[PDB]
Structure formats: structure tokens, C-alpha cells
Design a protein around this ligand. Structure first.
Ligand SMILES: NC(=O)c1ccc[n+]([C@@H]2O[C@H](COP(=O)([O-])OP(=O)(O)OC[C@H]3O[C@@H](n4cnc5c(N)ncnc54)[C@H](O)[C@@H]3O)[C@@H](O)[C@H]2O)c1
Ligand SMILES: [K+]
Ligand SMILES: [K+]
Ligand SMILES: [K+]
Ligand SMILES: [Mg+2]
Ligand SMILES: [Mg+2]
Ligand SMILES: [Mg+2]
Lengths: 105, 309, 48, 255, 81, 99, 123
RNA sequence: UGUUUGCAAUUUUUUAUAGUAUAUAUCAAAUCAUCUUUAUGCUAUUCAUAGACCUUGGGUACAGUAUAAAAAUUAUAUAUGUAUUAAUUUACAUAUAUUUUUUCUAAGAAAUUAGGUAAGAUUUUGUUUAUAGAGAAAUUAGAUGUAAAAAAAAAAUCUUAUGAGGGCGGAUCCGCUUCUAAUAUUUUUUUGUAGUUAUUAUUAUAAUAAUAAUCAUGUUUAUUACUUAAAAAGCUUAAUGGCUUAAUCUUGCCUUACUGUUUGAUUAACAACAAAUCUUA
């Protein structure tokens, strides 16, 4: 229940916190910005990595709750996603690293 | 039993767990699509008012715990590892370390009036005004013993900045407000100067700082970052002065502008701020303690070094 | 002087008026006052 | 699909969704929370059986055995009974459907649970109003030395609800009013209604006298009854009308 | 008429903090970084670990001069102990 | 079911609107007659004129100040505002569908 | 100026006019949250009662031991309560070196380090 | 179709049905700007296809570990292309000037606004402890205590009562008067001080006794009630008095800072009169 509750509150925070401004942490056309944009598209625009896929705004914003027997709220899936987002995905020259040449953390 | 007969016959709580087949057929996304229309709105359309107009006004405001409320804040997101640490190991050590045994039938101590009254044979003493606080001009809070019912804990932390030169360069106040934002995760409130000093070029009633207060879990998380990731990186750091303390269980100290940028939240985007604009902060740790020695004993349990000075 | 005595004329064209003072560097006065000729609250505007 | 089902949204939602109890909606957090409250309600009921049998042991116990006598045995059972009443409420106070059934007005008022939420609701907005009328209009100490109402009483004339202290016309206040009462204590009690005019001017002695405009006694009432028409108190409802309704009035000039 | 203010909170993430000890805990921060590797923390500082012998007897050549000398002229001149 | 229920909502809405407009047309007729009525009274010196206090009650009975009531309902503004947005978005669907 | 504009935009997004609005739940959604809130606050009660039960049980063990100690005589030719009066002293308890910083600095962690425990530690 | 999409949840009102006053539904208003394209784009894969990896056109995906199936979808003006048509016709790709999604240059970072009314807050000053730069002198954080399961009962000392229409003299007038009730006071005569959790001891997991803890079904940043010397701050302006339970502060709506006449006073304003002051209807 503690896990399901935290996840339940992380998605209410998504609906009530100000949006994330990448321009405040990453500057345009840099190794960090490009790396952030690639992985941000795999998360379907969600800047957070531990709340699955949920759009706070839009027609389907109401569907914030998760169904029973879900893996997203668990702590095992949380650590897995936070680690997959720490691996450098953009080489020093700005090109995406091949899927096979990516070193895990 | 007749008592059990007075309980509600049909209980939602004593219903069986949901069926797996029903779980498979429950698809909230397919309902909105299959409907191909918008369900009519409910006739209940109460929305919290923007102003509180009294306890007898027809329209009343709900408590902050109500999710639809205007001041609602999403609940906890995690357990601060320093709160679980304090409550798991250090709650009993401080209780065991500082313990005075009271015999079984010890009479309860009766507190004496702190604002004394004149007692004697002089007819003037009758209607005399109560005497002044003996010693200090304001009555200091009396120390409570560390019991199993009173374990000193951290309550809130106030990070404040004072930028006098911001009166000439307005951008020094914009940066100071942003550093204190990423550091604590809240929106600081601007403060103003209260005195007039020409030598220092200080003018009264002008914005010259910013202040944030973090409560609950946020304050336990900030302490961990400070203790384990910021303070261990300050070059030639000796420790919090042993003289810190206002006499009520609150510890205060300050950080340098070069130590404020050691905060992980400030070193990541350190290049987005103009040069030489990151300020120093005044960190005030408010605890449930009621003494200077209790607070210094509490912080030592969380891993704060104190030095003699 | 810094103060001037202005006259608020009734917009009911009844001739009644009120007299108040206000600084020169201020906007003309315009209030909702009671007109005893028609015995109702109407709009009163500064004369000038 | 008729109005007897409820609002339009319900009739629409009840035809485009699936048939499933609200308590069985497969939501993760909602079902995790429903299990914490489930195994807790079982602990409250297990406590009611523990305190229920603990009274029998004390009941079949000679008073002399208690070093405090018979007085110490009643204060011990008096506290145990009160502790059981609290356990019968905490067993359903967290139930989500008990809250829905109460908010819809379909709550069973013969149970302590629904009577607890009704008093809390009354003490939130309605009590604060009547508590204010008794003081500002000086019903205390003029009529009673001290008064703390414990039941709800809403009066309506000709089907129109009257707000506490509203100045009504002499034509409206011409027929007996209907009282929409609600008691929050268990069992059936006998009730007396009295309508008193406390500002009758007595010019012969330069003071005010009080005049009774209605009086009825022996009115059976239970926490399930809601409406009582003072018009029919002798035939429809059981009671003894000591004085039929006297149309209120106020002579010109008096307050 | 008391105005009911609303909370103005920025966006916050969940972060994995990996101390120098290799141990990892999760926190709630405003930065977008997912994993924060700490090369210098309490688990590696001498003020917090006054007994660990590994931390003491450390060169701690912050400036870099002690290492530049050894690169030019070698380790012949050193405080052998 | 959703389509027919909405028709019932619009039918009940038209009934109230039909009655409101049927009653609004009566008030505009009562006000027109009142503001157009000139009651000349024998004041003095055998002169006839309309009293000033009656000229003040032409706009409306005493108790309130005509012209200070709220012009419209904010619910109608929310209702109207939704309708405007729906077209705009629905309009973009037709254009990008036309392409 | 460019960088300051970035900082100002960060605040412009936090103004009351820009921040998202208060939530708007139906009934079944509101009732769903009412239980999650009703079960969480009850969970804290179960953790508060448990936590305060251990503190009271650990405290009563000290009272019992110290009460026995008060009425002991010894060891040897030492008056009653000597060990008790010596155990109730607070020498250095409220000093700087009261609690070792190696024990207080080590906090709980989700996962252990590369070397969970150091058995080779020598005095 | 305003209001969050799984279902009678706020207040008031309209209308209708059943009903004999109640009940349900509905309507309007109040409280609140929640953001709404059910997919036309995107993504992946797969066929063809002139093509030496790419060109052109079609399919496919089946979604609770929700999904490719919307993390934010306008409208143009020009130029430069490419491909296209009867046609700058039309569809894309670039750039640069715009407007649109109210969606990104902190007013909740500023202004010393002072009356009516409503609600809310109730020591604000100084002093003092501590606190990067910070020093005699800058900012911020602090600075009283108690209580919060529940009482029951006997008499007496007064004081009140438009209580018993009490009794007796002259129903509600009056001075004496018993009784009941209420407030206050006694340190008074006491009785009771449980229940719950835990510890200890005896007894056969329970019972009994003793000790400690105990406002808590509630976002612990708890809350609520009471208490917290005097001075000082504040209240258009000197000084005195006063206000902290409002006369101060904050906020919403407002402009009675209204028209006419008028009562009783300032021990019959200023030791006269007049101009004045407070007040009632
Ligand atoms: N809180 C109450 O309602 C309550 C009731 C009785 C007594 N008390 C007294 O107050 C003291 C403190 O109250 P408390 O013990 O209920 O506070 P708490 O420790 O349960 O709550 C502390 C803060 O952290 C949050 N929190 C609590 N548990 C958490 C968890 N498992 N994970 C993440 N976040 C969590 C809470 O929301 C709160 O903001 C108690 O020791 C007791 O003396 C409090
Ligand atoms: K807890
Ligand atoms: K005002
Ligand atoms: K004081
Ligand atoms: Mg004033
Ligand atoms: Mg102060
Ligand atoms: Mg005189």
C-alpha cells in the first residue's frame, strides 16, 4: 500500500506542479540537451521517469489511476527506469549511439 | 449478538477482492472511445470559493485535505531515509542516553508562577501589577526532559538570503530567488530592509532578500543533502559552532556563496546564472527540542560535527 | 491652493448638487448620491 | 432508464459502463486501501465481542466483591458500554458506501453510524445558526436560563421553508406549521411542542407578557421520523392538543 | 473575506543517489538528473570517519604540484614512511 | 442513450427559455406603459404638472438603483465559452481533414 | 539579459495565473480518494501506535532496572543506591563528543554498498 | 451537452409527476475560467517500386505493464526549391515577418490611501539568544504555561427569578415572607477517578490488584479553549487619555462624508447671549 500510495501522489503532483523547463537546466544544441530530447521522446514527453506515461493536461487527464496488479508502481520498475535513463545516449559529437554500443550503468 | 446487529448490514469493506476476469474487461480508455460522446455533467457542481467569508456564510470552504480544495498539496512521495533512521535507531539511544529515573510514587511537580505577585502585609501589595519576568526581558521556555513521550525531532527549516547590493542591481535578487528555489523546491517570498544606513547604502522598505520554509519530509530530505553531500565538500570545514542556539531548540548557521553552489541542484545548472550572483544563505533548523543542549544532542544523532568556538 | 472645492451636479437635471473638496492633481469626482427632489439615488457628476 | 434511477449522468453512465459494484473497481490504490480498512473493521468487531463478554463477567459479580461497592461496578460497566458504542461507529465510519447512502438520504437512522454523521452535519452549519438566534434575539435568558439545542427543528408554513427568525406575514402564519424534526439519540421518546409569543405588550402595567399559541404533548418520536404536521396531532398523530393553533399577530405600533 | 492562497511548487523528480560507498537511496529533487554519483561524501570524509585508517595517510594534493614534481623528476624525493 | 438524454435536456431548456421569453415580453410591456404614463396633478395656482417624486419612480419602484444589477450570468459565459472553443478545435479538424 | 530572462520565465510559469487549477473529481473518483486518504491516515495510526508502544516498552525496562538498582547494596561495602546514583550521572552526555559521529553519520539506505560490513577493522 | 467522464454527494429557486402536506426528477442562479478534435498527425514494421542504401504509393499494428492510435494539433504573407495539375492548381520541404493555442520578461518582486459595512488575524514595537559576508550600527529564525473520557451526591452561607401567577398585610403595585430552581462562594462531608495500550505481581490466554502513558478516526506544520507583567508599536498630525474581547492590521463589496424635521442633555456648553458639542425619534 505504501508503494501504491506514493505512485498515486506522484501523479497528482503531475497535475498540480508547474511544468518542467528544460531551458533552465540544459542549453540548446548540447550533448545534454540532445540526450534529454531522445530519452524524453521514449517516455512520450513525460519528463519524470517513475510515473509511467501520464499526460496531466488533455482530454484523458482523468485516467490517472492505475489498475490493480500493476508493475509500474513497484520499486523494482522504478529503479530499472532511473538506471536506463542514466546511460549516455548521445556521443560527444551529437549522434545517437548504436543500440548495441550503449554501455549500461 | 445484538450489538453486531446495529452495524451496517451491507459492508463494502467486507466484500471479496475484484475478479480477474472483471479486471481484464475493465478498460477505462475503451469506454471514452466506444462512447463517441460526452457523458452529461453531474448536477453537483460545488467548487471551493476563492475567499473565506465567515463561518456562517452559506458557501463554506473545505479543508486542505480535500483534493478539490485550492490549498491541497499531494501527499508523501517517499520516506526520507533520515526520518526512518532517527525513528529506527536513534529514537531509543537518545531516550536511553538521557534518562532520569523517577521513583514510582513521586509527587507531581507543581509549576510556580513566572510572573510573580507581591505578598505581604503592606496594603499596597494587594492591587500591585504582577512583577516583571525575572532575569531576561522575555520568559524563556522551560526545558522538558527527554522522555518516551517527548523525542526531539526536526520540524521545519528556514533558508533566507539577504542581498543589499540588489537594490542597485535588480538582477541580484532574481538570481537569489532562483537559487533558493531549486535548493528547496518551493517559491521563496521576497523580504525587505527595515533600517536606514547611509554608510552601507541601505534604504528602508525595499526588497533585499528572500526566504523559504520547508516542512515535514522536505526538511528531512534537505538535512540529508546538507549533511552528507554539501558540508563534506566545504573546503577546510570545522563544523557548526558550539555557540549556535537561541535557547529554544533551534540551530542556526550560514553558508558561503561558494558553498551554496555545491548543492547538487545548483551545480548542475551553475552555468545558467550570471557570474558572481549566487548568494549565501542563512539556514535555521527548527526542532521540537526545548533547549540548546537538546538540539545539539539531536543534531549529533543525525551526523552533524560541532566544534568549540 | 493644493485643495479645491468642486461641485457635483445631479444628472437628473433637477438642479440639486453636492460640494466636496479634493486635490487639484486628482481625477474628477463622480458618485452615486441621493437626490431629494426626485427622492431617489442618481448619478452625480462634477460640474466642470 | 426512467427518472427513478437518478440523475441523467447516472442513467447515461449506467448504460454505457459495466455492471460492477463500486467496491470492486479494479484500481490499485483503491483496493490496497480497502484491505487496510477491511482487516481493521475485523479487529474492531473482535473487540466488541471481547468487551461484550467482559460485561457479563462483571454483571454476574456480587457488588461486595468490588472494593468500591455497587457504585464502582456501575461506573465500570458505564465506561464499557460507552467504549462499545465508539467501536460500532469506527467499524463503518471508513466505509465508502455508508457515506454514499447517507449523502443520498437513504441512510438507516435506526443505526448509530448514520445518526453520528447526521449530528455532525447538523452541528456544522445548522446548529451554528440556531445557536446564534438564541443569543441575538435574547431567547436566553428571557425564556430559559441556559439552552443548548440537541435536535434539529425546521418549520415550514404551507410547504415553504422558513429561515430561523424570518419576519412572516400574518396570512402565511395563519395555519399550523409543519415541523421537520430530526433526533440523533437512540430509541423512542415522547415529545412536547410549545409555541410561545414572548413580546405581548401589556400597556396596563407597562411591560410584556408571554402568550401560548400552541401546546401539544405525548407525541411519540423516533430517529426515523422526520415530518410532524401540527395541524393533525389528535387524529393522525398520537397526542393531546392542550391548545390549538392560535394565529400569531402583532398590533400596530408595537415592535 | 480571507483569500485562500494556492501553493506554487515547481516540477520535482525522483533521483537515485549513489554515495561513494556504492550504496544507493532514492530522494525527491528538482533537478532532472536521474542518477547522482557522489565521489566525495560523508562516507569518504575524515571528519565523519575519524577511525578509518584508509582515509588518513592520504596525499590530498589538491593543487596538483606534488604530482607535477613527481612527473618531471620522479619519486626519488618523497616522504618515505 | 446519450443522444436521446441530451435531447430531453434541450427540451427542458427550451421550455424554460420559451417561458422566460414569454414572460420577458410581458415585463417589457408593463415597463413601457409605466414609463409612458404622465400623471398631471393640480398642484397650485390652478397649474397642472407631474410631480418630481413620481418622475423618479418611472424607471422602477424604490428599494434598488436601476442599472446596478449584474447584466448576465457567469454560467452562460462558461457555457458560451465552451461552445466557442468546441468550434475552434472542431474547425481545425475539418481543415486538417480537408487537406 | 538573456540568462536573466530565462530565470524570469521560470517564475512566470509559477505565477497563480499559470499554475494548474484545483482538481475536479466526480463522485466515484472522489470516494475513491476518500478511502485512500482514510486508509493512509489509519496506516499512520497503526505505525504511530506501534512506534510509541516500543518506546514505552523500552522505557519501562529502564524504570524496572533502575528501580531495582536503587534498592541494591553493593558491590561489597557500598551503601544502597550507589550504582544507581552513579548511573544517573550525565557526564559528557550533552557535550560535543557525546555520540560518535561514525555511528550517527551512517544512515539507512535502500541498498548496501560494495562492502556492506568491514570485518577486518583493527583497533 | 460548461464543469472530468463509473453511477442520486453543496445552497436557493423554477417547472412537472406521483401524492395529501411530503418524495423524486428537472430548470435557473450562486460557489469555480479544467485544459476536452476519439484521430485527420507521429512512431514502428511490412509489401511493392523505376533505384545505385534510397525514390514513389499502399498496407499492417488491436492497446491495463494501456497504445503507433496525440506532451499540446492556428491562420497566413512572402522568396527559394521539389513534385504536381486547365491553371504560383495542389501537396511537401526549407528558411523569415506575423499573428493564433490566454501557453514562459517574477506584481503572489512595486505603490506607506485613511470613510461605511462584513468577515478574518490579535504584542504588532523595543529588548534579548543565535545566525555566510556582517563591524557599535543591515537580514532571518526564535523567546509563558495549563487543559481537552466522564462525573454523581448531602447540607449550609448569601444573591437573584416575568418560578410555584405561593402565603399574609395592605396574578402582575408594595415592605415583610416559606418552597423549588439557577449563578457564585467553602479547603467544604464525601463517593467515584474508569476504559484502552503497556509493565510488574499473584492466580487458572484469562481474571484481580498496583504503577506509568493516554485531547486525537485526524493531511503534525495538528487543532481548539484558556493564560502570557508593564512600557512600546499602530490608530491623519503635538500632548494626555483610550482601544488589543476593537477604535489597529488584512481582504471583499461599497460611497449614510445621505435629504427634511425633531427629542433629551452638556448638573441650563464657554460662571451671559450668539457661532458651538454630544444624542433620540
Ligand atoms: N498525527 C496525528 O494525528 C497524531 C495522533 C496522535 C498523536 N500524535 C502525536 O504527534 C506525534 C507525531 O504525529 P505522527 O506520529 O502521526 O506523525 P507522522 O510521523 O506519522 O507524520 C510525519 C510527516 O511525514 C508523513 N509521513 C508519515 N508516515 C509516512 C511514511 N510511512 N512515509 C512517508 N511519509 C510519511 C506525514 O504525512 C507527515 O507529514 C506523535 O508521535 C504523537 O505524539 C499525532
Ligand atoms: K505514523
Ligand atoms: K474596507
Ligand atoms: K506583553
Ligand atoms: Mg481608522
Ligand atoms: Mg519582534
Ligand atoms: Mg451657562
Amino acid at each position: 500500500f505504501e508503494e501504491s500510495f506514493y505512485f498515486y501522489q506522484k501523479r497528482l503532483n503531475e497535475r498540480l506542479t508547474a511544468p518542467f523547463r528544460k531551458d533552465f537546466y540544459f542549453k540548446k544544441d548540447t550533448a545534454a540537451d540532445l540526450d534529454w530530447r531522445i530519452k524524453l521522446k521514449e517516455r512520450h514527453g513525460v519528463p519524470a521517469k517513475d510515473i509511467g506515461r501520464y499526460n496531466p493536461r488533455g482530454r484523458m487527464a482523468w485516467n490517472d489511476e492505475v489498475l490493480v496488479g500493476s508493475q509500474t508502481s513497484s520499486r523494482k520498475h522504478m529503479v530499472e527506469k532511473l538506471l536506463a535513463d542514466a546511460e549516455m545516449r548521445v556521443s560527444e559529437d551529437g549522434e545517437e549511439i548504436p543500440a548495441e554500443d550503449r554501455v549500461p550503468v | 449478538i445484538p450489538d453486531l446487529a446495529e452495524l451496517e448490514t451491507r459492508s463494502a469493506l467486507d466484500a471479496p477482492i475484484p475478479s480477474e476476469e472483471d479486471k481484464k474487461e475493465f478498460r477505462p480508455w475503451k469506454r471514452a472511445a466506444d462512447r463517441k460522446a460526452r457523458l452529461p455533467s453531474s448536477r453537483y457542481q460545488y467548487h471551493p470559493p476563492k475567499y473565506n467569508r465567515g463561518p456562517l456564510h452559506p458557501i463554506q470552504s473545505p479543508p486542505s485535505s480535500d483534493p478539490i480544495a485550492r490549498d491541497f498539496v499531494p501527499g508523501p512521495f517517499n520516506m526520507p531515509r533520515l526520518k526512518e533512521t532517527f525513528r529506527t535507531v536513534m529514537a531509543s539511544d537518545l531516550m536511553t542516553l538521557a534518562y532520569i529515573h523517577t521513583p514510582p510514587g513521586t509527587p507531581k511537580k507543581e509549576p510556580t508562577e513566572r510572573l510573580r505577585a507581591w505578598e505581604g502585609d503592606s496594603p499596597y501589595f494587594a492591587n500591585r501589577a504582577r512583577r516583571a519576568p525575572r532575569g531576561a526581558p522575555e520568559l524563556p521556555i522551560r526545558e522538558r526532559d527527554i522522555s518516551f513521550r517527548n523525542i526531539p525531532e526536526i520540524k521545519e527549516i528556514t533558508v533566507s538570503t539577504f542581498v543589499p547590493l540588489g537594490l542597485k542591481n535588480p538582477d541580484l535578487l532574481i538570481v537569489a530567488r532562483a537559487v533558493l528555489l531549486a535548493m528547496t523546491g518551493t517559491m521563496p517570498e521576497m523580504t525587505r530592509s527595515k533600517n536606514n544606513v547611509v554608510q552601507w547604502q541601505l534604504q528602508a522598505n525595499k526588497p533585499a532578500g528572500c526566504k523559504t520554509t520547508i516542512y515535514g519530509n522536505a526538511a528531512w530530505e534537505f538535512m540529508d543533502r546538507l549533511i552528507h553531500l554539501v558540508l563534506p565538500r566545504i573546503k577546510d570545514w570545522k563544523g557548526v559552532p558550539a555557540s549556535t542556539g537561541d535557547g529554544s531548540g533551534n540551530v542556526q548557521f550560514g553558508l558561503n556563496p561558494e558553498d551554496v553552489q555545491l548543492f547538487p541542484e545548483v551545480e548542475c545548472n551553475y552555468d545558467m546564472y550570471p557570474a558572481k550572483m549566487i548568494p549565501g544563505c542563512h539556514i535555521a533548523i527548527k526542532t521540537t527540542a526545548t533547549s540548546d543542549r537538546q538540539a545539539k544532542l539531536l543534531l549529533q544523532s543525525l551526523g552533524v560535527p560541532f566544534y568549540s568556538n | 491652493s493644493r485643495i479645491i472645492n468642486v461641485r457635483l451636479i445631479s444628472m437628473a437635471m433637477t438642479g440639486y448638487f453636492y460640494t466636496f473638496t479634493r486635490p487639484r492633481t486628482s481625477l474628477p469626482m463622480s458618485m452615486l448620491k441621493y437626490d431629494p427632489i426626485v427622492r431617489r439615488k442618481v448619478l452625480f457628476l462634477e460640474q466642470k | 432508464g426512467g427518472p427513478e434511477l437518478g440523475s441523467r449522468r447516472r442513467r447515461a453512465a449506467l448504460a454505457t459502463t459495466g455492471n460492477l459494484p463500486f467496491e470492486q473497481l479494479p484500481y490499485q490504490c483503491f483496493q490496497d486501501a480497502r484491505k487496510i480498512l477491511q482487516q481493521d473493521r475485523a479487529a474492531k468487531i473482535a473487540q466488541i465481542v471481547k468487551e461484550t463478554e467482559k460485561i457479563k463477567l462483571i454483571e454476574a459479580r456480587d457488588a461486595s466483591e468490588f472494593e468500591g461497592g455497587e457504585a464502582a461496578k456501575q461506573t465500570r460497566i458505564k465506561s464499557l458500554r460507552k467504549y462499545i458504542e465508539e467501536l460500532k461507529i469506527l467499524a463503518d465510519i471508513n466505509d465508502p458506501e455508508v457515506k454514499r447512502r447517507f449523502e443520498d438520504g437513504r441512510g438507516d437512522m435506526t443505526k448509530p453510524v448514520y445518526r453520528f454523521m447526521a449530528e455532525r452535519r447538523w452541528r456544522s452549519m445548522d446548529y451554528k445558526i440556531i445557536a446564534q438566534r438564541i443569543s441575538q434575539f435574547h431567547v436566553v435568558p428571557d425564556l430559559l436560563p441556559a439552552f443548548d439545542p440537541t435536535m434539529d427543528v425546521k418549520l415550514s408554513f404551507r410547504g415553504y421553508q422558513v429561515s430561523p427568525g424570518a419576519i412572516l406575514d400574518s396570512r402565511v402564519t395563519e395555519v399550523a406549521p409543519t415541523l421537520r424534526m430530526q433526533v440523533f439519540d437512540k430509541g423512542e421518546r415522547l415529545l412536547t411542542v410549545v409555541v410561545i409569543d414572548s413580546d405581548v405588550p401589556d400597556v396596563t402595567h407597562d411591560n410584556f407578557k408571554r402568550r401560548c399559541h400552541f401546546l401539544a404533548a405525548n407525541i411519540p418520536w423516533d430517529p426515523s421520523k422526520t415530518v410532524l404536521s401540527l395541524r393533525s396531532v389528535g387524529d393522525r398523530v398520537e397526542g393531546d392538543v392542550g391548545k390549538p393553533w392560535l394565529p400569531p399577530f402583532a398590533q400596530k405600533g408595537s415592535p | 473575506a480571507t483569500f485562500v492562497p494556492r501553493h506554487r511548487r515547481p516540477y520535482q523528480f525522483t533521483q537515485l543517489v549513489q554515495l561513494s560507498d556504492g550504496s544507493t537511496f532514492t530522494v525527491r529533487t528538482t533537478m532532472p538528473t536521474a542518477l547522482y554519483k557522489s565521489a566525495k561524501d560523508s562516507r569518504n570524509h575524515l571528519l565523519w570517519q575519524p577511525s578509518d585508517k584508509s582515509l588518513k595517510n592520504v596525499e590530498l594534493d589538491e593543487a596538483g604540484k606534488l604530482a607535477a614534481f613527481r612527473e618531471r623528476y620522479g619519486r626519488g624525493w618523497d616522504l618515505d614512511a | 442513450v446519450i443522444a436521446e438524454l441530451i435531447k430531453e435536456k434541450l427540451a427542458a431548456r427550451a421550455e424554460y427559455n420559451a417561458r422566460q421569453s414569454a414572460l420577458r415580453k410581458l415585463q417589457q410591456q408593463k415597463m413601457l406603459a409605466r414609463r409612458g404614463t404622465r400623471v398631471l396633478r393640480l398642484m397650485n395656482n390652478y397649474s397642472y404638472r407631474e410631480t418630481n417624486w413620481e418622475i423618479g419612480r418611472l424607471i422602477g419602484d424604490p428599494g434598488s438603483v436601476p442599472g446596478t444589477e449584474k447584466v448576465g450570468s457567469r454560467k452562460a459565459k462558461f457555457r458560451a465559452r465552451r461552445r466557442r472553443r468546441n468550434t475552434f478545435l472542431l474547425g481545425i479538424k475539418e481543415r486538417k481533414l480537408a487537406k | 539579459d538573456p540568462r536573466i530572462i530565462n530565470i524570469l520565465r521560470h517564475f512566470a510559469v509559477l505565477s497563480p495565473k499559470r499554475i494548474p487549477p484545483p482538481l475536479r473529481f466526480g463522485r466515484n473518483r472522489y470516494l475513491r480518494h476518500w478511502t485512500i486518504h482514510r486508509a493512509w491516515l489509519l496506516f499512520r495510526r497503526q505505525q504511530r501506535e506501534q512506534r510509541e508502544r516500543i518506546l514505552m516498552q523500552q522505557h519501562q525496562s529502564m524504570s524496572n532496572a533502575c528501580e531495582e538498582l536503587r534498592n541494591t547494596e553493593g558491590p561489597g561495602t557500598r551503601e544502597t543506591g550507589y550504582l544507581y546514583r552513579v548511573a544517573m550521572l550525565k557526564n559528557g552526555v550533552y557535550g560535543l563528543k557525546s555520540i560518535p559521529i561514525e555511528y550517527a553519520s551512517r544512515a539507512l539506505v535502500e541498498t548496501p554498498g560494495r562492502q556492506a560490513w568491514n570485518h577486518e577493522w583493527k583497533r
